[PDB]
Structure formats: structure tokens, C-alpha cells
Design a protein around this nucleic acid. Sequence first.
DNA 1: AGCTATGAGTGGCCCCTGTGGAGAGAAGCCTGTCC
DNA 2: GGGGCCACTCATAGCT
RNA 3: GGACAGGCUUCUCUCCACAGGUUUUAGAGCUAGAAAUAGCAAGUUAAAAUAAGGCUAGUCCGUUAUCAACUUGAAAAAGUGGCACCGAGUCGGUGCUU
Length: 1017
Amino acid sequence: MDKKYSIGLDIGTNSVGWAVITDEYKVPSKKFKVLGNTDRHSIKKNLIGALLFDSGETAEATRLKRTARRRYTRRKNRICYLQEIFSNEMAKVDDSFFHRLEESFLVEEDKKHERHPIFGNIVDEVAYHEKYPTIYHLRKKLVDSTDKADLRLIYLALAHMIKFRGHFLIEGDLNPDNAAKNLSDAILLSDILRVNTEITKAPLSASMIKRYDEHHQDLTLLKALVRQQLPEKYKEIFFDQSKNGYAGYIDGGASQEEFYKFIKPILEKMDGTEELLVKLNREDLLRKQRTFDNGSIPHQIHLGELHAILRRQEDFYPFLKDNREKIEKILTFRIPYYVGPLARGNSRFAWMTRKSEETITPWNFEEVVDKGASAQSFIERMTNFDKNLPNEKVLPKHSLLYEYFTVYNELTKVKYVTEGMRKPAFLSGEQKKAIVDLLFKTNRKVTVKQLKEDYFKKIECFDSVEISGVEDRFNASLGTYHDLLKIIKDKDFLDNEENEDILEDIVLTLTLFEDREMIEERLKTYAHLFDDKVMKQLKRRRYTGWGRLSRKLINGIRDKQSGKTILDFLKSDGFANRNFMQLIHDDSLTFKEDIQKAQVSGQGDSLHEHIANLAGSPAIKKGILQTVKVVDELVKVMGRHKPENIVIEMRQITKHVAQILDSRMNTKYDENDKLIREVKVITLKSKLVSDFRKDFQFYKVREINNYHHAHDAYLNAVVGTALIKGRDFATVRKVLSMPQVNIVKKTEVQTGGFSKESILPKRNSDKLIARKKDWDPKKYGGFDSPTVAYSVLVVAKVEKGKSKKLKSVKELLGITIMERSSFEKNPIDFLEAKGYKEVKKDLIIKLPKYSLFELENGRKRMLASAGELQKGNELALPSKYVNFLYLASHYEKLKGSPEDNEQKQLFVEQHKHYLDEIIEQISEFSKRVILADANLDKVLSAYNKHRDKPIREQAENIIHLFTLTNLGAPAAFKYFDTTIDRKRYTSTKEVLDATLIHQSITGLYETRIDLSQLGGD
DNA sequence: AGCTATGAGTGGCCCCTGTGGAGAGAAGCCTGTCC
DNA sequence: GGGGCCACTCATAGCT
RNA sequence: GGACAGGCUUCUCUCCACAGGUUUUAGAGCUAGAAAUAGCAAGUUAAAAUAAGGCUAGUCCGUUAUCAACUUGAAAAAGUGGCACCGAGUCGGUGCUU
């Protein structure tokens, strides 16, 4: 006999509750086989549980970092282009200059050439640094001086300008000397560059030099004043790097804001600090040259300085004169946003169409990359396909055909009432055409009043007309038709159906592109039909937005019997006058049959595909996938007999989950090709279950344990079955008080960044990771704290001691994400590289994160990483304590009748002895499985100290207390005024003799491996 | 004894950031018309 | 939020 | 229940750029003192890297999603675990089939 049963589900962002109920609301318990090498061959478990997993993440960070990588690569490419241009002449002046620049990061020992990068001799380096303290002095010198300068300094200036060329937020050419545009540019440049009194061709360099000079003067003044009045604080301000003083502001990591915050109170304590304080209020005291404000500098200033240098120094160096435009274009060029990556087919993010297989360089970008086709592909891929015809692209919203479709569809259901007419009548096709020609082609917006006054009253000679279905105006508007009539000024050209394709292409071109040059290029094909004025006016009009119906759907598909399209039927359909919905749903026409052919159901469709097609944050998609797998495994458990009812609650996403479950469950088709719905998919709202809990006193407290998800799923199923359909309440209370609930933490292999992104200074440690292959961390520093992908149990021998003696060992080794590929390629070589010898390959066990181990007395631990464990046991608290805690916590916030509130208050007051019982149970559970003796003693002392506090405060602080025994990583908590630090389990040796547990997604199937029998001494 | 080492434990600190431009879409609030 | 890392102090196992 | 149009908000995905931050090196520290150290001078900039690197050699790609165990599979993927009753502190006991 097949036992009828129903499955309840609770879907969240982090958990998926599942419960199996029979027709009598009982939860059956079955005896399951256990595999492995342990003696426990059979375990009895209840059919209720919850699944827990880490939340899914969005793709934002990956996109940001990928874009950053591309920017860095292209900047390096610009530098390489400049060096390639200069190489031939730099060979004659100083051959090894570029090698010195390239290897400057290395220490003195590892450098191949002389250590000084610029000149290679100390006297010239010192002279250069004295004459040009900052690069801006060199830039101004090269801008103004007419003397022949050393080519190396010219390269330094040009590279400095190219590498930091500035933003591109302003198009066109900008006048640095600043109609109303001149003033708008002048106030704009006022903040960018401040005060250029003496005439200088390069203003930015002059401003930076002014800032440096003011910095020097103010620093000298501050030193003098501090030394005169406050001798004791001189060392603190100018020597101590760990403070926020000037020493920390320059040689330390202190920011400008912190430096000002520290220095302001001291300045007020000294005399003669009026100017310094005024500057400090302006954020201009002792300011650096390289600050975060420079983000507002337009690239035109740098371009002007570059051009000035190239003009000044061209007479001495012939190669600069020939390559001036190349150097300028290196700075000015960027890849247009619609072009995308310049990938050669081998990138999934690419859409560029390349004309010739040459290498794309800034000097020949125009000749190689098809810009117009690239823009078309950029704007076409994102647009949604037509639902009725999945293989056809949708039309633009402002397309003429779309507007005609809307007008004819709206006029289809218009009813008019005249004198002598017993019933409202539909407008005929001739009437619709006449109305369109008279008003819709003459008025941008046509109102019901205008229609009645103009067409019925004047043409049809009807004095009184009543119209239904349209409210004071028609929504459809022929705005595009009016715009084209205004521009082209040819009514016959617009009214000719032979010109439909040309107008459609013109509208599509206007919608697709936003650069005027591309629009001009594509419209050039139709320049023979229009004059120059019409052509230029067309290039100015722009439309935005896309429609929902394709051209093939409206005017492309033709009925086999009649030959009319949907648009044609809307124009005239006889007495039927069927709208778009009726036309597509009419069985008498081939339209319905063609549409039914058009939809294709997924034949062997992958579930992940349809889930990815859904809309929403990826976390809910992960939850949906987990829910579906849970349902599949539950069906597998019950003998593959599909359940009668499925109740879910979480609303389009919920309906999508419902459709997925319906499609997977109900598949058999009857003799009439109709779906045989053996399984009913049910959607409920959590308000019903919440009211059910509040009415029948099934209170839940989320801070106690994780059983609440399973209880919510069980209540969902019970409520759904009861609604759609003493003993029942007793059964419910028995079920909700069960101690055994299957909680499973989904094991996941960690992925992501290799380690933390902060680069740390050099230090004698073996835990620093090199930034490059040849960069020893003891000399150059590097990254730290790699994230372990997964741990592997290793049984081998290690040479220990100074004598290098072989000792048999058994320990957990953590594989970092960086080494995952190398380890999976050949585990033996990787293990040998770490010093392990005589490795037994068959004993390598893959242990992902949150692997569950069992210990004595039922104590359980989950493997958080190679060196830290997490609590793995759930506290089973009797329901009466949960109810008392809920009632006491909301003691002053109960929402109900006064009699019920008084009854709850009395019940709280009478059972005050429950507090000591709760404390005792917490202590017993902690002593059994937590082993937090010091923290437990602190908790007990704090409870004893505050034993006279009001009941509500006691309950509120006790609710916080269950953080100690909660599943997962330990967390700190506050109990009254005393703070308890977290107890971390920083040793993994105890699990080397534990019983490893492998659990299926529901936890019903187990495979227990006892590691104590592996790798004995 | 006399000395060494080491691992084990405990307490505390640490974690890359700021912005601009272009486009495409759904989903949730309301109205109107329909199936 | 939670794992990694370091300074510090201690017991215990190891070697002489 | 779904579709179309109109008014508002939020979120999801892709591309182009910018400014910082961090790391090492270069910017001859001086004096007295064996040294510890004490005094004085100076401080604002620059080069390179910015996930190790990969082959498909591109001015491309590298942090999203997916993953209990055993057998078959490159992978996707497929296959593998008796029933009922009485009880309940992480599940136990009993009876039948086999």
C-alpha cells in the first residue's frame, strides 16, 4: 500500500526547511541503512529537518576587479608604446636607461646595472634632485625653457603625463585662458587650477609649485613657533611616526584629515597662529602635491602641456617632430564604451567585429574595427527577445509599425452610441481608416471630445455620440509620424506602404545609435531620397525605448486562409473586430497554431538554465535549486511515489518555483494531451502561519536554535492541507517537541581571492606569500593570510629534529586556493614538495569546509579550516521554556485582548522558577559539548549577581545567552553589563581520531568513516 | 637532577577606498484596456 | 563577521 | 492567472575611464662619542607591481554560478540504501519479509 503523504517547504536566503507529513499530520520515522566501517549499521530518524548554507554572492566585485585589470594592462601598453617610440634615440644617449627604470623595484644586490635609475652616477642624481625637487618643476622648465634639454628628462615628463593623463568627463576643446560658455568654463577652471598671476603656458605646474612653496614656508614657521613655545612636543610632532603628527603625516600612514585633527588644538595653544588656523579651516595647510583632489583635472591641461613641450623641444630632436601626432594620440585615445574589449574571439565578454586581422593600435583603430556594427551588436544583445516568437528581435517603441498596431488595436474595442441605436456598435475598418487619416495623422494626441466633434459630428452627421472604453483621450499616439511629417514634409512618402522598410530602418537607426557620426554614416544610404536639410534634421531626432512585439508577429506572419496579418486584421476584421489577444487566441485562424508552434518547451532542459533565466538576487536562485534537490531526494526516500500535496511559502519568484515544481512533478499527459496534475503545488502567505502560531501559543524564538525552520515548514504543510481539505492539537504539540531534527550544514569548497589585499612590510617570517615568482618575501614583503580551499588528511613520515629522523605522522594539511590546481594535477608531487615522505595515496580524503566529525559523548565539531573548529551541536529546549521566554520577552509588548494579556502575565509570574531551570540546562549542555569552563563560570557569576532584576530584563539577557550554544562560529555577546569574549577552538588534533560523517543533502543517508583505524602508529 | 623545545593556550588586533559616463532588463506601487 | 597572525605564558615531552 | 500602454521607486548584468592607498628602491644626513647614545639638519617627489600566472599569444583570460560518499564517466551526466508497530534528550526497542 502506498502511504499518502505531503511535503512542506520553507525557502529562504540561507535555509531551506523540509517536512514530510501524512494525512493525520504525523511525522513518520523510518530506519535507514548506514554505510562505512563503523558498527552502527542502522539509525532511526524523523522525516523532518532543515538545510543550512552560505549565502550566494553577486558578481559586482568580480566585474569591478576585471575592469581594473584591463585598465592596468592598457596603461602598461601606453607606457610601452612611448618607450618603443623613444628607443631608437635613447639607444645613442644611454643604452641601459630603460633597464634601470624597469628593474628599479629590486634591491641593490639583485640589480644588474648601476643602482641610480636616472643617470647611474650619484653626482648627477643629487644635482637633479636639488635642481628639480618635484616633477612639476621639470614640467614647467620644459614648458618654458627654449634650451636643448637632455632627452631623459623629456622622456620622464612625457611618461609622467601619459601615465596620469586625467579624466575625460568634458568633450571638445577647453580654453585654458578662461560667450556664456567662456564664463561657465572660467568658474569651472577656478577650482581645478588656483591663481595663475604671472604669465605661464602651463598653469597646473605653477599651481603645484605654489603649493610646494607655501608648504615649505608654513613648515618652517611651524617649526620655529613650536620650538620657541613648546619644546617638549617637538619630538612627538616631528619624530614619532606612530602618532598623527607631521612625522606620521609624511613618513607614516596618517591621512590629511587626521593630521589636521591632531594639529588644530595645538595651534590654538600657541600665539601667532592666525594665518595657520585660517589655512587649516580651508584645508590648505602643509598640503601635499599628490592628493585626492586632483580627480577634477581635465585631460586637456595635460594635453596642452604635452603639446607645449613637443613644440619647444622639436627643433633639436627631428624624431619628435615626425611623431608629435602619435604621442598626442597616445594620450587622447581611449576605447569607446560600445566597442568593448578588443578580443580575438577567445573571450566570452567580447562582441567586437574586426575587419582585418592586423594588430589593433591607437594609430590604426579606425581602419580595423567596424564601429557601426560594433555599436549594433552592443545594443542588440541586451534587448529582450519576443515572447510570442523567441527567435525574433523586438521592435523599437517609437517604430511607425508599432504605433499603427497600437492605434488599430485601441480602435478595435471602441464602441459608439448614436440616436436610434439599440446597442453600442464597433467602428468599421473604413471608419477606423478615416479616423486615423483625419485625426491621428493630424493630431499628436487625439481626445474623445475631438473625435466626437470632428468625425462623428462633422463627417458622419451625428449630433450626439457616446463612446465607451476610452477615457477622455486615446493612449496610442502617432508621435513618430508627426515628427517625420515635420522633418521630411512629404505626406505621400509617409503614407506609401512601399516605403515601409525605409522608414522602419530609419527609425531603427535613430534608436540604435547615439553618436551622430554613425547615424550620418548609415543614413547616407538614403541620402538620395532626401535633401540635405531633411537629412540633417533626421540626424538630430532621437528615440529611446523598445517595444514588446516583433515585426514578424504584427505584420510578418500571414494567415494561410486569408493572407492578412495581425495588423491587417486590426485594420479590418469584419463583424468579428478581434483585438490582438483575440487574434492570437483565435482557433479559426492559423495564428494560434503558428504561435503554439513558436513556443518551444525545454527538451531535456537543464534545471540550472531555467533557474538562471529567473529574475532576482542569486541567493534566492541558490535557495530554489537547493529546494528542488531536497524535493527530489525526499521523493527518492518515500519509494518514488510522488506526494499528493506540496506547500511552499517565501510574488513572481514564488510562482516560478511553483512552476518548476509542477513541471518536474506532473509530467504524464492524458489522451487529450492535457497535463495530468497528480501533484498540487500550493502557495501560502506567512501571515496565516504567524496567526496560527499566535492563536494556539506555538511561539518561536529565533535565538535558541535552528529547529524553527523545520517547525515553520511543518506548520506550512499542516495549514495548507487543513485549509484545502483535540487529536490534531495533541499531534502538533508532540511533533513540535521532538528533540531529533536533521540539521545539515552544506559542505562547500571555498573560492575567491587568494588572500588579503593589503601588502605587508618585510619581516622574517615564513607565512608571507611572494607577490612575484622572483620576489623573496623576506626582502620585498607580500600578501598574507591565504584562504584554504579544503583540507586533506595525510598519512606519511616527516623528517623532524636536527638529525632529520623519520617519524610517522597523521595530520590535516590545508590546500590554499592558489595551490589548488597544482595539487589536483598531481597530489603526490605536491605532498612531497612539503616534506612528507612515504605518502599513502589511498588515504587522501577530501575534507571540504564544514565537514562534520563525531566525538565522545555525542560531541560534534565542524571543520572550519585547517586549524580551527566550530560548534556542531544543537540545544534541544523543551517547548514550555520557549513559550515562557517568548511571553517574558514581549511582556510589555503583547498585542491582544486585555484578558489574554493578563492571563499571559499571570502565567509568566507563576512560573518564575523556570529561570533557574533554563540556567541549569544551559550549564549542563555547555559542560557536555561546549567546554567553555571560564566563560560558563563568568555566565553563572553574572546570573547570580543580577538575580533580583525584573523578569523582562532577565528574559532579554537570557535570550542573548544562547549565543554561546548556537551552531556555527563562536561569537561574543553582552549579558547585562559584563561582556564575554569568544571561545575559539584553535586545535584540530582531537578530530584525527574522530568518526567522519558524510551526509546527503537531507542528512538521511549517512556514510560514517572512523579515522582512528586509518594510519595507526 | 639540568636544560631545551614546542605546542597549546589566551588575549588582542587586523581586514583596499572614493567617483564619473553609457546601455539593457525585471520587480514592486497605481490607473486604463483586454484574454 | 570570522578566520589569520603575533606576543606571552605555561605544561609537558624530549634529550642529556 | 496572463498580456499591452501610461506615472513613480528599487534592484540585477555588461563596457569605458579617473583619483588615491600599499610595497621595494633612488633622493650622499651632519657633528661629538669605541658604542649605547645626545644635539642639529631634512621631510611634499619619482620608477615598477597591484590577485601567483595561463595558452588560445589576444592591447585576451584569472575572485559569479555549480560540488555528501561508492560504481560508470574528460565533463555534463547516469546508477546505488526493506516494511510495519510501540515509545523519546539528538534517537531506542520489537515483529515480519529477505
